[PDB]
Amino acid sequence: LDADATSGAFYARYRDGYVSGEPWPGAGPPPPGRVLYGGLGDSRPGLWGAPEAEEARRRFEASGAPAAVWAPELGDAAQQYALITRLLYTPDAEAMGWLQNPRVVPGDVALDQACFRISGAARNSSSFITGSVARAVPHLGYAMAAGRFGWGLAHAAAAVAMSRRYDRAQKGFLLTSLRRAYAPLLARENAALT
Amino acid sequence: DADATSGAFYARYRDGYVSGEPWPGAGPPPPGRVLYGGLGDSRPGLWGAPEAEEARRRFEASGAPAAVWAPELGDAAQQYALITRLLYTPDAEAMGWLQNPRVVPGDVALDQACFRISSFITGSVARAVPHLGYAMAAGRFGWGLAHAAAAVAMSRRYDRAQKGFLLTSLRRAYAPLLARENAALTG
DNA sequence: CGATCGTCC
DNA sequence: GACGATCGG
Ligand SMILES: [Cl-]
């Protein structure tokens, strides 16, 4: 009955009231001395100078590659978003396998434990809302605060990669689909916000 | 890394696949069977079963997408079209509907009957979304939006406001893709 | 009761 | 592969 949609005409007319580069409603930077963590608007204090944050930041700066376990104390969220987004398009990178099960050193686990420790949350579990399904992907709030819809690819790809319901070949098809969808969006968004 | 920062790298990216062409290793299920599990696997059909007929006339009476879909209810292309359109309808609560849909006793009866005729791999993270193999066999990259959105909706790491931002992000990315692919594969 | 997901085989 | 902790319908 809905020939307007199956023919593509409906999607050809798509538009919204949101502007790229402007903050998503209710989103914004974390308070001073704190970093984004958990749900929308939630935050935890910073761990700059702690032994866990200092060890991980040095490994991150000495490698030039995206960190396996990322935290805002390691550097710019825009830099880790750019690295992961690029990794999703680089040939023979096996990015979906890296997002689900990255090679983790003991320093990455300590950084992850210290990040939840300072948060003051009661219980850590599979149900705890963290704002990122994969620890390598920065908190989604930084994309919401910056109005960077192209940074949603990293989260959408990581959600598919973390799911236990698709096999390797099925995940590869979804990465190809996501690649096609986001490539013109990323090109337009990066050109405008620079 | 100015090529990627300026966006020129992403404007140049091109794959080697063609919309409408079968994905490598993917195809229709064997005659008399329906796609199931991982890539290439399948299970026998239930087209004449009562549970499949009780949920078919329910899905055929209401022009809305089924809450628990199965190939015995109709063509996968129809359910994919309804879910994709629903993901773009303002105030549809599509992400919450994918995660926790209203389920009748007839839906779980059809659910149970599919496991009996047949690992954690199912080929669809949400039961309303048809098996991914149907999109891979049809070369429908636009049918990945339903799976990508459903994966986000099923995740426990984002709250509702965070999922809403990703829905708009997925909307803006897939809208030009869907307009081009739907027009090319339907005329 | 189902799910995700940390954590092993 | 699985087992379990742990939340929402
Ligand atoms: Cl194409």
Residue numbers in the entry:
A (entry chain A): 293 to 486
B (entry chain B): 294 to 411, 419 to 487
From the paper:
The IE gene product, infected cell protein 4 (ICP4) is a transcriptional regulator with a prominent role within this cascade. ICP4 can induce the expression of E and L genes, while conversely it can act as a repressor notably of itself and also other IE genes. ICP4 homo-dimerization is mediated by the DBD, this region interacts preferentially with a bi-partite and asymmetric DNA consensus sequence RTCGTCnnYnYSG (where R is a purine, Y is a pyrimidine, S is a C or G and n is any base). Here we present the crystal structure of the functionally essential ICP4 DNA binding domain in complex with a segment from its own promoter, revealing a novel homo-dimeric fold.
The combination of the ICP4 DBD, residues 258–487 (ICP4N) with a 19mer DNA duplex matching the consensus site from the ICP4 promoter (IE3_19mer), resulted in the formation of a stoichiometric complex, which can be readily separated by gel filtration. It was also possible to form a smaller ICP4:DNA complex using a combination of truncated ICP4 DBD, residues 288–487 (ICP4NΔIDR), which eliminated a predicted IDR, mixed with a shorter 12mer duplex (IE3_12mer). Superposition of the truncated ICP4NΔIDR polypeptides with ICP4N (chains C and D) indicated no global conformational changes and a backbone RMSD of 0.8 Å for aa301–484. However there were some local structural differences. The ICP4NΔIDR·IE3_12mer data therefore indicated that the isolated globular domain can bind to a segment of the ICP4 consensus DNA sequence, but with some local structural readjustments, in comparison to the ICP4N·IE3_19mer structure which contains the complete DBD and whole consensus sequence. Characterization of ICP4 in solution by analytical ultracentrifugation (AUC) and SEC-MALS exclusively detected an ICP4N homodimer in the presence and absence of DNA, and the truncated construct aa288–485 (ICP4NΔIDR) was also a homodimer. These results suggest that an absolute requirement for tight specific binding is the presence of the intrinsically disordered N-terminal region, whereas if this region is deleted, the affinity for DNA consensus sequence is not only reduced, but approximately half of this consensus sequence is no longer recognized.
